[PDB]
Coordinates of N, CA and C and ligand atoms in Angstrom, one line a residue:
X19 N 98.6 108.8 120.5 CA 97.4 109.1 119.7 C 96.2 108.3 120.2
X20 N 95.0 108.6 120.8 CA 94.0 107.9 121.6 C 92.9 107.6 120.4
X21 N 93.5 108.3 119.0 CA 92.6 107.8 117.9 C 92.8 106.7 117.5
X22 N 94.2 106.4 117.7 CA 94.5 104.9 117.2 C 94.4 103.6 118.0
X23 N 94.4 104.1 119.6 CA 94.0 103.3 120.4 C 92.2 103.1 120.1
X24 N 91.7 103.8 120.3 CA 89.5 103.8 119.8 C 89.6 102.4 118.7
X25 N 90.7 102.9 117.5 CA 90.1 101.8 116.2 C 91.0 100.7 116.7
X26 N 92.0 100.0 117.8 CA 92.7 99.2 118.1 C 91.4 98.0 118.8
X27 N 90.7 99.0 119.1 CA 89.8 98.5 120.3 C 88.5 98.1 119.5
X28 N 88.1 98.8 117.9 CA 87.0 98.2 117.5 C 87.5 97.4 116.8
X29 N 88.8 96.9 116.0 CA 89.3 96.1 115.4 C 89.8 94.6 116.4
X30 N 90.0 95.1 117.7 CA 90.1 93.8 118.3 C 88.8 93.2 119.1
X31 N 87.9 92.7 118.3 CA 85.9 92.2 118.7 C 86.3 92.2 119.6
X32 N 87.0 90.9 120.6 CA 86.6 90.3 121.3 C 87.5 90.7 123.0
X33 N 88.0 91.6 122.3 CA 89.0 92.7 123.5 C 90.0 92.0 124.4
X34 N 90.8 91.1 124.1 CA 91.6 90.4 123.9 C 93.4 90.4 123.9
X35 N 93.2 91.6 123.4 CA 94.5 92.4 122.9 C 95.1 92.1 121.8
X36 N 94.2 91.2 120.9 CA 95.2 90.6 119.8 C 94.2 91.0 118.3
X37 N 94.7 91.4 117.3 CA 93.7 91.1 116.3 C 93.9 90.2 115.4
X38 N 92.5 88.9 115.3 CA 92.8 88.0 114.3 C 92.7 88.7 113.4
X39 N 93.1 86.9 112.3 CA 92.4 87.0 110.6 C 90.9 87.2 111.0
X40 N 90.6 86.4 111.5 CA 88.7 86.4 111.4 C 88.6 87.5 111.9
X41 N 88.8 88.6 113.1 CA 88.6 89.7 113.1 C 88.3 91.1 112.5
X42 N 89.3 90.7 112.0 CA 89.9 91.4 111.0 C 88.9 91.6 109.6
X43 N 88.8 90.4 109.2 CA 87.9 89.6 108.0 C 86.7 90.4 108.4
X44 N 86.3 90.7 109.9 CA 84.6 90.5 110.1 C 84.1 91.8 110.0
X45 N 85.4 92.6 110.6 CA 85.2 94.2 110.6 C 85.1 95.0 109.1
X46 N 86.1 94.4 108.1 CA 86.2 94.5 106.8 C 84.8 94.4 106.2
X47 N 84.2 93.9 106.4 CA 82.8 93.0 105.9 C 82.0 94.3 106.3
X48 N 82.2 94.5 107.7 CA 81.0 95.3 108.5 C 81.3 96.7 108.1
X49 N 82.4 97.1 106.9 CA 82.5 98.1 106.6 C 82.3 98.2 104.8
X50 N 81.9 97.0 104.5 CA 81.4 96.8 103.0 C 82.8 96.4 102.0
X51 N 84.2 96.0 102.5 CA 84.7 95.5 102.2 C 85.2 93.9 102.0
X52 N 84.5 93.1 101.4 CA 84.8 92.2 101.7 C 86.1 91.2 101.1
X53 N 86.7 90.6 102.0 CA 88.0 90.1 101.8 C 88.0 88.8 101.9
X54 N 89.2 87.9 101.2 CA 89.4 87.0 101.5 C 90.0 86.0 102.3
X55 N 90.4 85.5 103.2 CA 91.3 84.5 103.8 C 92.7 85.4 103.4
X56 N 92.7 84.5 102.1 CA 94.2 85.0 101.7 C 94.4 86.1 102.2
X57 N 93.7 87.3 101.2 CA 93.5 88.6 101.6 C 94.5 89.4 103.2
X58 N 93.0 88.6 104.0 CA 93.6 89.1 105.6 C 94.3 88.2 106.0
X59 N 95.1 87.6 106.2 CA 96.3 86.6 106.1 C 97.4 87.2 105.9
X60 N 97.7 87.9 104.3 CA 98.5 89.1 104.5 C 98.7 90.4 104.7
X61 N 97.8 90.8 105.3 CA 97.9 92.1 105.7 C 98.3 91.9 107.4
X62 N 97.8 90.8 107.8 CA 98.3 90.3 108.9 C 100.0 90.3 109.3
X63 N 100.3 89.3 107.9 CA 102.0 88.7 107.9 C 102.6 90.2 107.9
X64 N 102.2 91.5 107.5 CA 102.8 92.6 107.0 C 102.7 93.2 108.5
X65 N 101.6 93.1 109.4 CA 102.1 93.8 110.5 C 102.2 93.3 111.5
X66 N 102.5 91.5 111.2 CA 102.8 90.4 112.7 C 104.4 90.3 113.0
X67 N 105.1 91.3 113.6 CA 106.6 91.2 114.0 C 106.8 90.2 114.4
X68 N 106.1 89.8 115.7 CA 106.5 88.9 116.7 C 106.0 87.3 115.9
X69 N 105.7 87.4 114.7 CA 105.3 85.9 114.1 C 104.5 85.0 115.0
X70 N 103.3 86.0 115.7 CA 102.3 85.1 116.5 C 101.1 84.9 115.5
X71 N 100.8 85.0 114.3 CA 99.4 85.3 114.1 C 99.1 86.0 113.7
X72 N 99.2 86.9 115.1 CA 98.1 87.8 115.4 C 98.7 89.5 115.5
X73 N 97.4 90.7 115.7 CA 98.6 91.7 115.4 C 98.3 92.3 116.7
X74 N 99.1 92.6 117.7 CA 99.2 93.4 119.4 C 99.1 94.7 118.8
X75 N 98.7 95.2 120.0 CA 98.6 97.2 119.7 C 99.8 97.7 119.3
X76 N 101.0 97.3 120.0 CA 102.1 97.3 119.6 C 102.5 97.7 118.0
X77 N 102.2 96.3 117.4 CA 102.5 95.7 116.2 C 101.6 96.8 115.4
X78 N 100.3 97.2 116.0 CA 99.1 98.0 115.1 C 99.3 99.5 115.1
X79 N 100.5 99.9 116.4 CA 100.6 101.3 116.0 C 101.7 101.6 114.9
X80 N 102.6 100.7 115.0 CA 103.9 100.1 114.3 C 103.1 100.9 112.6
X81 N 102.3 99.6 112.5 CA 102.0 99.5 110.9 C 101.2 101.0 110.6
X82 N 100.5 101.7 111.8 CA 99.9 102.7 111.2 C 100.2 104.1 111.2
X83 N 101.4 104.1 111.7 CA 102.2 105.1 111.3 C 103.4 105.1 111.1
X84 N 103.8 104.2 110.3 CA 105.3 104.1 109.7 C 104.5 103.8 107.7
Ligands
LIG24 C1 92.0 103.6 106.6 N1 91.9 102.8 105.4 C2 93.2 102.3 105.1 C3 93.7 102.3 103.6 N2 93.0 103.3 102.7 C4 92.3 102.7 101.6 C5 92.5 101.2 101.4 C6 91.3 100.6 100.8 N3 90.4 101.6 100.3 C7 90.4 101.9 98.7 C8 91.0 101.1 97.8 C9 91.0 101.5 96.4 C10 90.4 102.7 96.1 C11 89.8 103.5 97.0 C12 89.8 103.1 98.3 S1 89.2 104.0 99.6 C13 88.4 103.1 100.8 C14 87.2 103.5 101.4 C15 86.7 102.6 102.3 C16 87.3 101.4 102.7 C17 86.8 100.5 103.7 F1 85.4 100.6 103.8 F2 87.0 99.2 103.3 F3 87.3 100.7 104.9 C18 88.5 101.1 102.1 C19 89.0 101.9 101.1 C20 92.1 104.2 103.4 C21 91.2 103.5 104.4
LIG25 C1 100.1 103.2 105.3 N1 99.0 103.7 106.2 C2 98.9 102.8 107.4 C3 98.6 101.4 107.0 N2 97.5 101.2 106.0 C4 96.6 100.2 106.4 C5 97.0 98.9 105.9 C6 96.1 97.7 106.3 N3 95.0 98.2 107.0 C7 93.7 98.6 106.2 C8 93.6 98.5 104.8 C9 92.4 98.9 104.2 C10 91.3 99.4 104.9 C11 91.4 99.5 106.3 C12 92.6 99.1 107.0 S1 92.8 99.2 108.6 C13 93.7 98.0 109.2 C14 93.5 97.4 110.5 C15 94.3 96.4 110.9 C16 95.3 95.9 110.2 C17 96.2 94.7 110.7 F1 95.5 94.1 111.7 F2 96.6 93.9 109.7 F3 97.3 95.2 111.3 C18 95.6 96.4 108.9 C19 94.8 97.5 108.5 C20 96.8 102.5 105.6 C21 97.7 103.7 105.5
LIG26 O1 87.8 90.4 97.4 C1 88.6 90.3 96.4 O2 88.5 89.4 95.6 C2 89.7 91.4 96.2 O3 89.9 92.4 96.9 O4 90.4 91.2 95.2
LIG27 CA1 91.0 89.6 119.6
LIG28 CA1 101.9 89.6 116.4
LIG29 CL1 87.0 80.9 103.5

């Protein structure tokens, strides 16, 4: 799906391949959601398999279509 690759690529700012909490946080914001630490922290833990942090494309197609 090259839709889910597009929003991998605006969710990850800094093109990196990874998406932080602060990323994550900043894009939320820029969409009139605003969240907290905590917040994106766990939405994180819910799609970080690999227990880095952070979430790989990998991990982000994982969580968006299961
Ligand atoms: C793709 N994305 C994933 C999950 N869902 C909704 C989760 C948050 N959501 C929400 C929560 C409670 C009641 C209504 C809505 S709709 C909505 C609209 C915009 C956003 C905004 F602006 F924050 F993105 C978030 C949401 C649909 C949107
Ligand atoms: C179940 N189905 C797929 C998963 N969810 C999205 C859950 C979290 N999600 C989210 C929630 C509210 C509004 C937008 C988004 S998009 C998004 C982007 C990255 C992550 C990150 F970086 F944490 F993986 C999690 C999310 C919506 C519907
Ligand atoms: O931002 C908040 O406080 C929330 O979503 O509960
Ligand atoms: Ca990044
Ligand atoms: Ca990870
Ligand atoms: Cl803070």
């Amino acid at each position: 799906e090259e839709e889910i690759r597009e929003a991998f690529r605006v969710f990850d700012k800094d093109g990196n391949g990874y998406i932080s909490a602060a990323e994550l946080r900043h894009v939320m914001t820029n969409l009139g959601e605003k969240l907290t630490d905590e917040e994106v922290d766990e939405m994180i833990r819910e799609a970080d398999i690999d227990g880095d942090g952070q979430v790989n494309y990998e991990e982000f197609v994982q969580m968006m279509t299961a």
